[PDB]
Design a protein around this motif. Sequence first.
Motif, short mmCIF file in Angstrom:
data_model
loop_
_atom_site.label_atom_id
_atom_site.label_comp_id
_atom_site.label_asym_id
_atom_site.label_seq_id
_atom_site.Cartn_x
_atom_site.Cartn_y
_atom_site.Cartn_z
N UNK A 97 20.18 7.09 2.15
CA UNK A 97 21.28 6.63 1.96
C UNK A 97 21.41 6.33 3.47
N UNK A 98 21.08 6.59 4.03
CA UNK A 98 21.27 6.43 6.17
C UNK A 98 20.37 4.85 6.01
N UNK A 99 18.92 5.73 5.55
CA UNK A 99 18.08 4.56 5.49
C UNK A 99 18.13 3.03 4.99
N UNK A 100 18.74 3.52 3.65
CA UNK A 100 19.08 1.77 3.11
C UNK A 100 20.39 0.83 3.64
N UNK A 101 21.28 2.12 4.33
CA UNK A 101 22.50 1.63 4.49
C UNK A 101 22.30 0.46 6.04
N UNK A 102 21.53 0.68 7.41
CA UNK A 102 21.88 0.72 8.91
C UNK A 102 20.13 0.43 9.11
N UNK A 103 19.49 0.92 8.24
CA UNK A 103 18.16 -0.05 8.30
C UNK A 103 17.26 1.20 9.19
N UNK A 104 17.82 2.16 9.56
CA UNK A 104 17.09 2.77 10.75
C UNK A 104 15.71 3.79 10.15
N UNK A 105 15.33 4.48 11.55
CA UNK A 105 14.10 5.57 10.35
C UNK A 105 14.83 6.53 11.32
N UNK A 106 15.21 7.61 10.42
CA UNK A 106 15.51 9.18 10.31
C UNK A 106 14.50 10.01 10.56
N UNK A 107 14.73 10.43 11.67
CA UNK A 107 14.33 11.94 12.02
C UNK A 107 14.44 12.63 11.16
N UNK A 119 13.42 3.50 16.67
CA UNK A 119 14.30 3.44 15.52
C UNK A 119 15.42 2.11 15.74
N UNK A 120 16.24 1.52 15.52
CA UNK A 120 17.46 0.23 16.27
C UNK A 120 18.49 0.95 15.51
N UNK A 121 19.80 1.52 16.69
CA UNK A 121 20.73 2.14 16.85
C UNK A 121 22.04 1.57 16.05
N UNK A 122 23.08 2.63 15.55
CA UNK A 122 24.14 2.44 14.33
C UNK A 122 25.26 2.26 14.82
N UNK A 123 26.16 1.40 14.92
CA UNK A 123 27.46 0.53 16.27
C UNK A 123 28.25 1.51 16.88
N UNK A 124 29.28 1.56 15.41
CA UNK A 124 30.28 2.95 15.32
C UNK A 124 31.67 1.60 15.74
#
Lengths: 42, 273, 90
Positions: free
Chosen positions: C40-50, C85-90
């Motif tokens: 889900x997080x990989x589909x929304x934020x284009x990050x790579x989850x560890x 990975x890139x960072x999510x904002x908040x």
Amino acid sequence: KRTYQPSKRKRKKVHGFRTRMSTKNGRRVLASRRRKGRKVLS
Amino acid sequence: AIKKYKPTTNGRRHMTSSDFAEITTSTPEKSLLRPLKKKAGRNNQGKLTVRHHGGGHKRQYRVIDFKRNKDGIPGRVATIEYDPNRSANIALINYADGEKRYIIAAKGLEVGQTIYSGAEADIKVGNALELKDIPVGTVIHNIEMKPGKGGQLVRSAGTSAQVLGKEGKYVLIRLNSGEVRMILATCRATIGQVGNEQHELINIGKAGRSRWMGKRPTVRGSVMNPNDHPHGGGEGKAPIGRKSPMSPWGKPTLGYKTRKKNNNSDKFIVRRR
Amino acid sequence: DARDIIKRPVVTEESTSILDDKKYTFEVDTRATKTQVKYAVEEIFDVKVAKVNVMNYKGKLKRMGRYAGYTNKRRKAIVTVTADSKEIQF
RNA sequence: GGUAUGAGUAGCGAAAGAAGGGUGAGAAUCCCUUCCACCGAAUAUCUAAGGUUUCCUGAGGAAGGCUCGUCCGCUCAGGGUUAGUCGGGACCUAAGCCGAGGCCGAUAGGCGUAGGCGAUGGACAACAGGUAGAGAUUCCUGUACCAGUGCUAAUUGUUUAACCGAUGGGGUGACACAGAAGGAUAGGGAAUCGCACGAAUGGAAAUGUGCGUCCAAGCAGUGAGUGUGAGAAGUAGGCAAAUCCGCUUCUCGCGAAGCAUGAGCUGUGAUGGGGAACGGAAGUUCCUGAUUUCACGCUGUCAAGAAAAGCCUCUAGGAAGAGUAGUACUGCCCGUACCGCAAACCGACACAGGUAGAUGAGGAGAGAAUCCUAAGGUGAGCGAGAGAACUCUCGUUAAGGAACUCGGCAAAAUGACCCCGUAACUUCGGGAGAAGGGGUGCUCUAUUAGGGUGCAAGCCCGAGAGAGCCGCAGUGAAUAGGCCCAGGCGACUGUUUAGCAAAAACACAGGUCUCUGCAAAACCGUAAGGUGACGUAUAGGGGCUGACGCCUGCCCGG
Ligand SMILES: [Mg+2]
Ligand SMILES: [Mg+2]
Ligand SMILES: [Mg+2]
Ligand SMILES: [Mg+2]
Ligand SMILES: [Mg+2]
Ligand SMILES: [Mg+2]
Ligand SMILES: [Mg+2]
Ligand SMILES: [Mg+2]
Ligand SMILES: [Mg+2]
Ligand SMILES: [Mg+2]
Ligand SMILES: [Mg+2]
Ligand SMILES: [Mg+2]
Ligand SMILES: [Mg+2]
Ligand SMILES: [Mg+2]
Ligand SMILES: [Mg+2]
Ligand SMILES: [Mg+2]
Ligand SMILES: [Mg+2]
Ligand SMILES: [Mg+2]
Ligand SMILES: [Mg+2]
Ligand SMILES: [Mg+2]
Ligand SMILES: [Mg+2]
Ligand SMILES: [Mg+2]
Ligand SMILES: [Mg+2]
Ligand SMILES: [Mg+2]
Ligand SMILES: [Mg+2]
Ligand SMILES: [Mg+2]
Ligand SMILES: [Mg+2]
Ligand SMILES: [Mg+2]
Ligand SMILES: [Mg+2]
Ligand SMILES: [Mg+2]
Ligand SMILES: [Mg+2]
Ligand SMILES: [Mg+2]
Ligand SMILES: [Mg+2]
Ligand SMILES: [Mg+2]
Ligand SMILES: [Mg+2]
Ligand SMILES: [Mg+2]
Ligand SMILES: [Mg+2]
Ligand SMILES: [Mg+2]
Ligand SMILES: [Mg+2]
């Protein structure tokens, strides 16, 4: 040592919903408690 | 033999025990053990239906061979073992084909001896033949009542039966009780007294040892209240205030014959006891 | 869908204190597995989850004048994005 | 329902506090400091149950808190629980429960086969640091392991059988209780070494005082030990098959090797981590030594001591992909806060009660006793005076010493260790700690004499004797049997009227009577189905009696 020695499992196994549903007389109890409109059966 | 304990305590004072001299191993045949749970005299209703049972030592069941099916294969007696489920010792038989079975250990059945079952079998002790093939006057045990069902009639320690004669397709056996009945001639029996005949001499010696054997105490009728037993009640000790002593359930319990009056087997009983 | 699995971010003194450790805290669907959250997080934020750590919070009992009841049970996911990975904002 | 009376009365629920400082509208009661006191086989530390937010932070002081209250387990807001490896589930079965068909039964239903479910048991891979308002084997750092997955690379098969392999066979898994001696390690001590100090009131630069004095899983080695005779033929059994098991024979036979296991140790892990002092030294030796572990290993006993999965192996089957190496990825759900011998659980209470398990230091000691202490925890949610009667809980008591009283009820006395000594009676075990006497401190001759560890140095246990010394008194405190004589009853250890009876009552081993030939009798159930019993007359049911010894007479008319 008093009469109520609690046990989550014993509570549900003796008085729980599935146990009430497992017998005709238990279903009577559920029917009765529904008819009286109890918030809590079992 | 019996060993008399020295009275070091009041509990050992008169206590006697087997010397277990006959016993050759302490390690039963793992393949022939089944689990066995205590019932403490309770029914499938969970109700206590036989009094005075409960809480002995845990036991395994040894699958005994009371049938004696293996005709014409030599069986070598490997060991005489203790069996907690019965008064008699048992014997692990190594059959030439490599099958192992337990039998009831007959009096004089020693390790090394070779037992035989069937029609060719000799009249030596632990051998099993059909009663049609057993001579008159012989001493037998583990007598079956229905062909192929397995012995049920004299299996307890020291017990023996004697063949008296042959009437048609039946044989007159004189059972351990001294009863004489007609066993079907195709029923097989084993030769010789059952063995461990010292068993009856044993003195349990203390309350606790009965508790170890799974026996709970017996309360006499006459120290109960009237609502519990016909001998209940009475101020102080009382005699039996009845015309006859009574079981807990009514029913006379001295000399009152309880064998069913119109019983199918009666035609086969020749003398009672 | 993935935006039904991720409800909303969790903004607290604790959750903000680990935004530098590349650990982002979300309120997720109470039925969502941490595998469903990782994708889900990989589909929304284009990050790579560890890794994804998840905890179930049972509802808290609150009174408002005679009337007592429970707040909603929550499922909180802490998503650690890899070091590249890139960072999510908040 | 309201409100009186009793009444400003009973009570405020075991316990040690003090002052100073602070906070604040306000302080015996909140915070800090110091001293004091209490628990310490717990009043400490974990963990399960149970509770369910009580946890943390900030704000509050109406009500709740037996007083107060600035405080709180209370009120209001916000927060807080992170797992492939911990516990549970995607694994296993026990009791028990359910139960397709089935059997039984006015209805309802009862029973039960296959098959399921069901831990309190079996199986199963992670450790040490760090960090902190609130979680941590879960987060972070380091170093691993288990199960998978692809991706590269050789290697070898690619239809005569590499490889996998049963839902079947076999082995293991797999078990009681007691006891004894060992190995090891935890733990506990000394010294050693390191750092600091060098002193209040007479003395001490020193045998002086204080604080410290080391570290994982994993991996690689080893290793006290513990078990175990290997190998080859053959094959009425293991439902088919089997190279596996079982059985038989023959050779080799031995006590040793191999082969299984195996606590611990050494190395690495660690150039890391921790550590007495705004930060960083020492890590050694010896003694002691388990309630842990090796390990139910060994020995013995009779009361004869789960299952299943898992794992190993066997073939039946299935088969071109398999393993090996490297590399990088993958690993779900539930629980995780906090209390937990308690103010958070069960007791209507912030209640002298109850609540399973793990750990549980020192001195003297047999000890987890006892007393005082360590680590750690606590001063108990009313106080200040007073020091009458009376009540309770305690201490002492002239002379007398059971005269008290239903009755020595209560209290007193006895008590540890060592030495002497010990009756009747007896079922020869006992009685027995019988009874009754004596002793007990300190110093020196004492690196003890001699012992244990030990290659040695050294370190631990050290008797009896003698000589002395001090007190009224030397297990100087605390904790440790009162004893005897003669009867009744019950043989005995056990059991009982939860909450007025613990007994001579019940039970008991033993005895005897009786029923019962197995679809046993007896018992539960309308029945089926059960228990009896997976027992079989040396067994099972019922009645009476109640160890043991000596005995148990006459009467069968009712
Ligand atoms: Mg209740
Ligand atoms: Mg009986
Ligand atoms: Mg009575
Ligand atoms: Mg009556
Ligand atoms: Mg009378
Ligand atoms: Mg009477
Ligand atoms: Mg979790
Ligand atoms: Mg008054
Ligand atoms: Mg007054
Ligand atoms: Mg007062
Ligand atoms: Mg109080
Ligand atoms: Mg104590
Ligand atoms: Mg709090
Ligand atoms: Mg108040
Ligand atoms: Mg406050
Ligand atoms: Mg990890
Ligand atoms: Mg079952
Ligand atoms: Mg079953
Ligand atoms: Mg299950
Ligand atoms: Mg905490
Ligand atoms: Mg077994
Ligand atoms: Mg916790
Ligand atoms: Mg309490
Ligand atoms: Mg208890
Ligand atoms: Mg302290
Ligand atoms: Mg006096
Ligand atoms: Mg005097
Ligand atoms: Mg007098
Ligand atoms: Mg007198
Ligand atoms: Mg008088
Ligand atoms: Mg008198
Ligand atoms: Mg007294
Ligand atoms: Mg003393
Ligand atoms: Mg008695
Ligand atoms: Mg009573
Ligand atoms: Mg009483
Ligand atoms: Mg029946
Ligand atoms: Mg009697
Ligand atoms: Mg008797």
